[PDB]
Write a protein that binds this ligand. Structure first.
Ligand code: CLA
Ligand code: CLA
Ligand code: CLA
Ligand code: CLA
Ligand code: CLA
Ligand code: CLA
Ligand code: CLA
Ligand code: CLA
Ligand SMILES: CCCCCCCCCCCCCCCC(=O)OC[C@H](COP(=O)(O)OC[C@@H](O)CO)OC(=O)CCCCCCCCCCCCCCC
Ligand SMILES: CC1=C(/C=C/C(C)=C/C=C/C(C)=C/C=C\C=C(C)\C=C\C=C(C)\C=C\C2=C(C)C[C@@H](O)CC2(C)C)C(C)(C)CCC1
Ligand code: SF4
Ligand code: SF4
Ligand code: SF4
Lengths: 37, 144, 165, 740, 73, 146, 80
């Protein structure tokens, strides 16, 4: 019932805490460095 | 008196150089150039650190910011009784005379000068911030 | 008696603490010859310990389960049960001394304020005047009431500085 | 011409100024209007330079202020000798030094404080001292409280002389500036007279009193039956019996037959097996050599004859192709600026005090000093702290000179000018070195902590896991140890047992043994490098940027001690050279706190300990090597485990250390109020309090004011160091006295 | 030149230092100080922000319930 | 801190079954430091040691993690901007004078944190270490003892 | 840029103008005080916010007031 597989953490933990942070940091840094038209 | 023209090929005081000189800002944004006349060769203190010898007659130096130029302006006037003048120079060749703006040092009242940022009231007559709220941006009752 | 406490005079823990304290002092008194100055000193501390445990019990102090004297601070319980020398009387003793210091200091500041250089009389103390006020401070309580009743103790708000508001 | 030049009756001796507070200042003499005046009076009392622009007047004030200090020190020494003669167990300790604990402070029986009079032994009750005076007096050959009482009286006669000299050389015959500017003459007398004569005289006392008296003490002779020092000084037959060469008199000295005096002038090295201290015969031949060396050194500078050197000539001669003008201008700077002299003197004197701590512990010079762990730990820590404070002071006075005495007209293209011209290169490079050390020193501890917590001990830096051995220090130790047989043939033994070899045991306790150096030692030596490099970074930066920076170009006009230049330029808080000294103090405290903790744990873990049948049991059982590689290891096995003595001292004689331990934690936390706050808040709070005083007509004429920004910073750092150092002091003394 | 962030304060957007990044994050929820802020817009922004806070709280509770039901005992 | 210390110590003694310890040791500050902090910290600081680690290892690591953040706050709280601004200016010179490194440049001119910002960053570091340190000590002492 | 303002309480001491280390102020002819001169702030764009002018101002309360505002390369006194 609404139970994720055993590999969930082996994949979710890597993605959330490493991959997603990198993606977020990349887009955020770009926006701040972007200058108003 | 007329606005002076900066001669960029003026002799510079004798100095071996330092690590407190101009940075990339001088080539991209702007730099400042102080000029003065010396009646005798006198060693003086570089606001950027180090001793330097002013040359007889014309002298020219370049600083990264206006405060450094005015700092040297203070030493030359107070200690050597000289009368220096400085300018802001842009990377496109444009030169802007800065001090003394009217040829008369600011502390000496001069005609023609029009008052700016003056309030015909005492600070205790400023309005309460609630009155200047929701204006175009964050402002102070003093600005109104 | 009060709060379920027990007289130190009837507490067994109070008695055990006194024995424990005297046994430490005695274990040390042994390593020394009888007339040796060290021995005389340990004996005088043992006598002072015996007098303290006896004097505290005689004063009718109450002791908790820890066997240590507890002080009753309620004016009602202290007066009705004989425990006023613990907090009540001490309170009026301190209040008299503390008001004494305050009233004398206030009298000094007021006296030096009418001089040529009050600031000078604060760094260099006018000893004669200071001694005079120090002796006249015994009747401060009555003087403070007489000032409170003449309206001379406080300052008028109109004469006191404040921020813009 | 070097000559005595003075002014007669320069200043009148009256109490007129005593009754006029702030008379020395043009701003303070006007009297107080606010409370700031009181602080300013005390803060500017000994700043003669700011008092007057006359160098001669400043020099005369400095000279007399030094005589006042010398008089203070003499009273302090007389008190120590007096307390040793009237309030101590020295005579009993002389008979039984391995069991009786030194004590020279007795407390009066009041409010129950007599508990502090512990059972030190010898039929005596008092506070156990750790100054090492008992061992010093035994080394000097003192055997009676009469000798301690006589020296105490002498010290007071000397203190009275010092205070007289101070009054005389300021009010009666004040030396002129030319007199003080005789640097060549001053160095010749201080090297030849003060140092060489002082060492020669001490050799006289040691050879005629310290050596025979201590030889008899070590032979087991009772202190009562030992010949009095004069009996040995007036009889050669007694000295001849103890040392056969004395039968020949001083003939061998003038005939160059020095070898005959081999029985009292020796090069044994190592330690006396009976006492655990250096051989006095070795200390005698040493001070004799020091005396000769310094007597020669004091004949190098030119005075009133052509022979000798000119310090100005030597300096002007040392110039190279990479340093422009070179040492030109330094002679003028070091003969007209006291702050310049104080900067160099404080730097060397502090570095020296730190060197004394290491040398005195490894080569214990006094009898029965090595096995007195309380005294050993106290001495090392005390001299280490004195050194660190003096080093920070060196930085402050270097900045004071750069701000007040530096003149560019006298420093063009010289070493000083060229240093200021590449200051950004110096600070930026030092900045990187500090960051590299930090990560590669403290990062290793974090790695170990994480690996241990993650249950991966094999991935840690340890003598069993990954190893970081200090090979260079291990090679030097081996070289110094084997020195006696090859590079130092005459020496019987190596200078110290730390290098290696057999251990020396006195009273069943280890006096000294070899000290092994492994990964944990390598890690803590790099923490020291980091902490020192960073402290230098702050102090150096404060001195090089004292006159100006890219942020502030007229810092020199603002002065040495100023709060800031306003919130402009983003914020210019703490830009003054004084503020750099304020920050340097915290890092100096952090560095030395780590240094003394390292010494205590290493000594308690690998050196100190009872020697039993077939085996030495150390105090902490050698847990430094496997417990000092993690922060958790330090917090648990050092702070938490060794705090048991101070936390359990209540009800005993060490109860005072427990009270001071809490009181010190308090003072330290109280400093944070001043260090984290600003005067703007306090001034307003005072305004509302002043209102209550105004309402009851009890407001003071001297207006109450919040402390100045600089005073707020000075009060905070003072209470921080006081609290922190006192806390370690209570922890160290309670721990060592209990498990000594 | 004028950077895009923060869009609520041209002043900060015209700051050429790293302070712009810190202050843009520090003054994002101070609506009253935002450029061109009106009382009505102030209330509407807060109302929407309050729905956002509620959304986060309920997801936090759902997350807690899920991990207990999936990894606990 | 004082209120939570009081609550925890009174409950630890009640849970252990000897309220007398609090009743006799809470009347002096040495009692609080030795009978509450020092005594109840043994198992926590032994979460990981040269002999191995236990389930309390995360709390031992966190306890020290909080001490580090708390002390890092002291730097932003005691040291002020002026000193740092002058240090950064030297680094800006170093980067522009370093070959190859000067090829890459910054879009935002590096500056020291502001005065108000530094007070906030210091208070945050101070507050985070305060909470993390006590939370690590509280859970470890109660769980390990019971 | 920081906001610098002069108030009618100005006595024309010129101290603020002499204290300013960036030439943000000057003296202009006036008729409100005996000195017949009043301080003016025509170059506030060069102001850094040192507040030296306010420290030099002797009037109670200050006649010259500085309000820290938008930060620029000049306002931050950056030589880079
Ligand atoms: C605020 C709610 C919340 C929080 C705090 C967490 C926290 C966590 N989740 Mg989780 N999760 C949530 C909601 C939440 N979850 C919901 C609503 C779902 C249903 C879609 C899931 C489904 C989920 C799965 C399938 C897994 C986790 C896992 C984890 C852990 C891995 C940490 C990580 O960053 O990797 C991943 C983090 C996430 C996938 C959720 C992001 C939540 C962050 C902390 C915000 C972590 C402690 C992993 C785990 O169990 O590790 C042992 C894992 O496998 N979560
Ligand atoms: C300042 C805080 C404070 C507090 C919390 C208390 C609390 C207490 N007082 Mg009290 N008391 C105080 C100040 C205070 N007192 C002061 C400043 C005085 C000096 C006049 C007294 C004088 C006083 C007397 C004479 C008595 C108490 C008594 C008591 C206890 C019961 C009183 C009551 O019913 O209500 C609480 C009381 C107050 C909030 C204020 C004063 C107490 C009132 C005026 C006394 C009335 C007591 C009344 C007879 C109830 C008890 C009945 C019987 C057992 C005597 C109670 C625990 C009674 C007691 O237990 O004696 C054995 C008692 O008779 N107090
Ligand atoms: C009765 C003897 C006597 C008298 C009447 C005077 C009188 C005078 N001296 Mg003087 N002096 C004396 C002895 C005396 N001196 C001695 C023995 C020395 C050698 C140290 C000096 C060295 C000296 C110097 C260098 C100077 C004076 C100066 C002066 C004049 C003003 C300063 C002053 O005295 O204010 C009173 C000052 C004090 C009361 C401070 C006392 C200082 C003591 C020694 C410090 C003790 C600190 C203590 C040991 C530790 C405190 C720790 C803390 C925890 C309590 C004044 C007319 C000054 C001057 O010429 O005017 C500008 C000057 O610069 N004196
Ligand atoms: C043999 C010559 C000689 C000796 C032994 C000394 C010794 C000393 N001088 Mg000195 N000095 C000398 C020659 C000498 N000086 C000459 C020729 C000059 C002129 C160039 C100076 C100028 C000078 C200055 C400017 C200063 C000293 C200072 C000092 C003291 C530094 C404190 C210290 O480290 O010692 C430790 C202290 C002791 C060991 C106590 C013992 C001291 C006794 C009195 C030895 C006698 C010294 C004295 C010069 C002998 C003549 C006394 C006679 C006039 C009555 C020290 C005691 C400093 C000072 O202020 O001292 C007050 C200092 O500032 N001297
Ligand atoms: C400051 C260092 C110092 C001093 C003071 C002494 C002092 C002394 N040593 Mg010695 N020694 C020293 C260092 C010193 N030593 C060192 C470094 C070594 C290692 C090489 C030695 C090795 C050594 C040996 C092997 C011996 C001595 C001996 C002696 C004693 C006899 C000296 C002698 O024979 O005639 C020296 C000549 C003089 C001292 C001249 C005296 C001039 C007088 C005092 C002047 C009086 C003038 C006055 C106006 C008179 C009027 C008086 C008044 C009442 C009217 C003597 C007390 C001998 C000894 O022990 O005797 C038992 C001896 O055997 N020493
Ligand atoms: C031979 C050593 C020596 C000497 C001669 C001087 C001399 C001087 N120093 Mg200096 N200093 C030294 C070492 C020395 N220093 C060291 C080692 C440090 C590093 C900490 C400093 C750091 C330092 C600073 C930061 C400053 C000076 C300043 C000065 C000048 C004025 C002193 C003053 O302010 O008077 C007044 C002295 C006092 C009010 C003493 C204060 C009380 C002390 C600090 C409390 C210490 C704790 C105390 C022991 C607690 C006792 C117990 C308690 C319960 C009572 C003066 C010429 C000042 C200066 O140059 O002016 C611009 C200045 O700002 N020094
Ligand atoms: C525990 C508190 C603390 C800490 C950690 C530091 C740390 C530091 N201080 Mg400092 N300081 C402090 C308190 C502290 N201080 C206090 C209270 C004061 C007031 C007196 C000062 C005053 C002060 C001054 C005046 C100066 C410093 C300087 C420095 C730096 C020296 C250079 C260096 O070692 O770089 C290396 C960095 C470290 C050693 C930190 C170690 C961190 C670990 C090992 C790294 C882990 C990273 C991690 C894996 C990242 C991933 C996390 C994940 C979430 C992604 C350094 C980072 C100097 C400086 O600015 O630098 C030159 C400087 O001048 N401090
Ligand atoms: C029946 C009509 C009704 C109801 C149910 C609500 C309900 C709500 N309105 Mg609302 N409102 C209404 C009419 C209503 N409104 C009307 C007519 C107007 C126009 C005048 C408004 C205008 C309005 C505005 C402007 C706002 C709200 C907001 C809110 C939300 C408050 C957010 C909150 O604090 O969480 C829920 C609050 C509670 C559940 C109250 C209980 C709190 C107690 C103290 C907790 C105790 C719990 C218990 C003791 C222990 C629990 C233990 C365990 C279960 C954990 C909330 C859900 C705010 C919002 O929009 O948020 C998104 C807000 O900004 N309303
Ligand atoms: C050690 C430095 C050797 C270099 C050395 O001492 O040689 C000395 C070198 C030669 O000096 P000259 O012979 O030209 O003149 C010296 C005269 O002043 C008298 O000695 O002087 C320098 O140019 C120093 C170079 C600056 C130093 C550059 C890097 C500094 C290293 C920082 C710390 C490293 C650890
Ligand atoms: C005369 C004097 C001075 C005093 C000046 C002034 C104006 C003092 C102001 C006093 C004022 C306004 C007090 C206002 C309220 C005081 C109240 C309500 C009294 C509270 C006391 C209570 C409830 C008693 C508590 C207890 C008693 C019976 C005593 C003890 O048993 C302890 C306890 C708590 C149980 C100057 C100048 C400071 C200088 C100096 C001498
Ligand atoms: S916070 Fe204090 S030290 Fe910093 S700029 Fe303002 S007044 Fe100066
Ligand atoms: S704040 Fe500084 S730069 Fe600005 S007007 Fe005042 S003195 Fe001039
Ligand atoms: S300092 Fe004040 S009173 Fe004087 S000219 Fe400037 S604004 Fe006017």
């Amino acid at each position: 019932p609404f139970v994720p597989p055993s590999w969930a953490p082996s994949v979710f933990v890597p993605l959330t805490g490493l991959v997603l942070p990198a993606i977020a940091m990349a887009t955020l840094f770009v926006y701040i460095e972007k200058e108003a038209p | 008196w007329t606005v002076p023209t900066l001669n960029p090929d003026t002799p510079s005081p004798i100095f071996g150089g330092s690590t407190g000189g101009l940075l990339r800002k001088a080539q991209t944004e702007e730099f400042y150039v102080i000029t003065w006349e010396a009646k005798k060769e006198q060693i003086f203190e570089m606001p950027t650190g180090g001793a330097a010898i002013m040359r007889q007659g014309p002298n020219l130096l370049k600083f990264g910011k206006k405060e450094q130029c005015l700092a040297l302006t203070t030493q030359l006037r107070n200690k050597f009784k000289l009368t220096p003048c400085f300018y802001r120079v842009f990377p496109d060749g444009k030169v802007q005379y800065l001090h003394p703006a009217d040829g008369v040092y600011p502390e000496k009242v001069n005609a023609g000068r029009v008052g700016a940022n003056q309030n015909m009231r005492r600070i205790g007559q400023n309005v309460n911030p609630i009155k200047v709220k929701f204006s175009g941006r964050m402002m102070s009752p003093a600005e109104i | 008696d009060i709060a379920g406490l027990t007289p130190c005079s009837e507490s067994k823990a109070y008695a055990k603490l006194e024995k424990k304290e005297l046994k430490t002092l005695e274990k040390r008194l042994k390593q020394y010859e009888a007339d040796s100055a060290p021995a005389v000193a340990l004996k005088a501390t043992m006598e002072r310990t015996k007098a303290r445990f006896a004097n505290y019990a005689k004063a009718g102090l109450l002791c908790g389960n820890d066997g240590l004297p507890h002080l009753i601070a309620d004016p009602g319980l202290a007066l009705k049960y004989g425990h006023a020398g613990e907090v009540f009387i001490p309170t009026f003793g301190f209040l008299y001394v503390a008001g004494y210091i305050g009233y004398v200091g206030r009298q000094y500041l007021i006296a030096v304020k009418g001089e040529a250089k009050p600031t000078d009389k604060e760094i260099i103390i006018d000893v004669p005047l200071a001694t005079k006020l120090a002796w006249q401070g015994a009747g401060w309580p009555l003087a403070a009431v007489q000032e409170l009743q003449r309206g001379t103790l406080l300052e008028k708000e109109e004469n006191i500085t404040v921020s813009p508001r | 011409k070097v000559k005595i030049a003075v002014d007669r009756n320069p200043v009148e001796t009256s109490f007129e100024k005593w009754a006029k507070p702030g008379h020395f200042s043009r701003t303070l003499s006007k009297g107080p209007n606010t409370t700031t005046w009181i602080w300013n009076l005390h803060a500017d009392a000994h700043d003669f330079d700011s008092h007057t622009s006359d160098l001669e007047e400043i020099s005369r004030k400095v000279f007399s202020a030094h005589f006042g200090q010398l008089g203070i020190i003499f009273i302090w020494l007389s008190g120590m000798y007096f307390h040793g003669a009237r309030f101590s167990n020295y005579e009993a300790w002389l008979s039984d030094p391995t069991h009786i604990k030194p004590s020279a402070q007795v407390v009066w029986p009041i409010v129950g404080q007599e508990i502090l009079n512990g059972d030190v032994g010898g039929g005596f009750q008092g506070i156990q001292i750790t100054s090492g005076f008992f061992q010093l007096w035994r080394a000097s050959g003192i055997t009676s409280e009469l000798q301690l009482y006589t020296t105490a009286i002498g010290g007071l006669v000397m203190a009275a002389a010092m205070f007289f000299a101070g009054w005389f050389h300021y009010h009666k015959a004040a030396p002129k500036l030319e007199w003080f500017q005789n640097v060549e003459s001053m160095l010749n007398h201080h090297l030849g007279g003060l140092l060489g004569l002082g060492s020669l005289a001490w050799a006289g006392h040691q050879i005629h009193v310290s050596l025979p008296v201590n030889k008899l003490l070590d032979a087991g002779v009772d202190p009562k039956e030992i010949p009095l020092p004069h009996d040995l000084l007036l009889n050669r037959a007694i000295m001849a019996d103890l040392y056969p060469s004395f039968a020949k008199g001083i003939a061998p000295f003038f005939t160059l037959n020095w070898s005959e005096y081999s029985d009292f002038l020796t090069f044994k090295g190592g330690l006396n097996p009976v006492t655990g201290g250096l051989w006095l015969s070795d200390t005698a031949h040493h001070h004799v050599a020091i005396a000769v060396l310094f007597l020669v050194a004091g004949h190098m500078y030119r005075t009133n004859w052509g022979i000798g050197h000119s310090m100005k000539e030597i300096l002007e001669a040392h110039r190279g192709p990479f340093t422009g003008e070179g040492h030109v201008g330094l002679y003028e700077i070091l003969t007209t600026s006291w702050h310049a002299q104080l900067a160099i003197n404080l730097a060397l004197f502090g570095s020296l005090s730190i060197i004394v701590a290491h040398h005195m512990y490894a080569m214990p010079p006094y009898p029965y000093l090595a096995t007195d762990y309380g005294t050993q730990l106290s001495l090392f820590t005390h001299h280490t702290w004195i050194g660190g404070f003096c080093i920070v002071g060196a930085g402050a006075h270097a900045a004071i000179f750069m701000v007040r005495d530096y003149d560019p007209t006298n420093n063009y293209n010289n070493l000083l000018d060229r240093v200021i011209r590449h200051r950004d290169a110096i600070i930026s490079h030092l900045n990187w070195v500090c960051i590299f050390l930090g990560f590669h020193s403290f990062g290793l501890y974090i790695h170990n902590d994480t690996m241990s917590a993650l249950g991966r001990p094999q991935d840690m830096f340890s003598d069993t896991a990954i190893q970081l051995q200090p090979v260079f220090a291990q090679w030097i130790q081996n070289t110094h140890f084997l020195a006696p047989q090859l590079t130092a043939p005459n020496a019987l033994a190596a200078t110290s047992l730390t290098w290696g070899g057999d251990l020396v045991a006195v009273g069943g306790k280890v006096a000294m043994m070899p000290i092994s150096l492994g990964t944990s030692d390598f890690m803590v030596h790099h923490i020291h490098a980091f902490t020192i490099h960073v402290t230098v970074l702050i102090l150096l930066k404060g001195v090089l940027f004292a006159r100006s920076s890219r942020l502030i170009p007229d810092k020199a006009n603002l002065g040495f001690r100023f709060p800031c230049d306003g919130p402009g330029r983003g914020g210019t808080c703490q830009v003054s050279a004084w503020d750099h000294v304020f920050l340097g103090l915290f890092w100096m405290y952090n560095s030395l706190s780590i240094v003394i903790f390292h010494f205590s744990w290493k000594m308690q873990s690998d050196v100190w300990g009872t020697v039993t049948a077939s085996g030495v049991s150390h105090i902490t059982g050698g847990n430094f090597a496997q417990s000092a590689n993690t922060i958790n290891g330090w917090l648990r096995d050092f702070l938490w485990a060794q705090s048991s003595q101070v936390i359990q001292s209540y009800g005993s004689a060490l109860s005072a250390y427990g009270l001071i331990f809490l009181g010190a934690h308090f003072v330290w936390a109280f400093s944070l109020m001043f260090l984290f706050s600003g005067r703007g808040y306090w001034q307003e709070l005072i305004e509302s309090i002043v209102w209550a005083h105004n309402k009851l007509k009890v407001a003071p004429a001297i207006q109450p004011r919040a402390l100045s920004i600089t005073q707020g910073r000075a009060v905070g750092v003072a209470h921080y160091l006081l609290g922190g150092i006192a806390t370690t002091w209570s922890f160290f003394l309670a721990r060592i006295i209990s498990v000594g | 030149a004028t950077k895009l962030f923060p869009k609520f304060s041209q002043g900060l957007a015209q700051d050429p230092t790293t302070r712009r990044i810190w202050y843009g994050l520090a003054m994002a929820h101070d609506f009253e100080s935002h450029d061109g802020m009106t009382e009505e817009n102030l209330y509407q922004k807060i109302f929407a922000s309050h729905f956002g806070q509620l959304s986060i709280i309920f997801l936090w509770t759902s997350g807690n319930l899920f991990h207990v039901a999936w990894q606990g005992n | 801190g004082w209120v939570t210390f009081y609550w925890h110590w009174k409950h630890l003694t009640l849970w252990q079954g000897n309220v007398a310890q609090f009743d006799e040791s809470s009347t002096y500050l040495m009692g609080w430091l030795r009978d509450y902090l020092w005594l109840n910290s043994s198992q926590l600081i032994n979460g990981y040691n040269p002999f191995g680690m236990n389930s309390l290892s995360v709390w031992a690591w966190t306890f020290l993690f909080g001490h580090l953040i708390y002390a890092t706050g002291f730097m932003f709280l005691i040291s002020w901007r002026g000193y740092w601004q002058e240090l950064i200016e030297t680094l800006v010179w170093a980067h522009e004078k370093t070959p190859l490194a000067n090829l890459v440049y910054w879009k935002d001119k590096p500056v020291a944190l502001s005065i108000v910002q530094a007070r906030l960053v210091g208070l945050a570091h101070f507050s985070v270490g305060y909470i993390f340190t006590y939370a690590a000590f509280l859970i470890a002492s109660t769980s390990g003892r019971f | 840029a920081h906001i610098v303002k002069i108030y009618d309480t100005c006595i024309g001491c010129t101290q603020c103008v002499r204290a300013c280390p960036l030439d943000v102020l000057e003296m202009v002819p006036w008729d409100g005080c005996k000195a017949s001169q009043m301080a003016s702030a025509p170059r506030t764009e060069d102001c850094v916010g040192c507040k030296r002018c306010e420290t030099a101002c002797p009037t109670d309360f200050l006649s010259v007031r500085v309000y820290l505002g938008s930060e620029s390369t000049r306002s931050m006194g950056l030589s880079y």
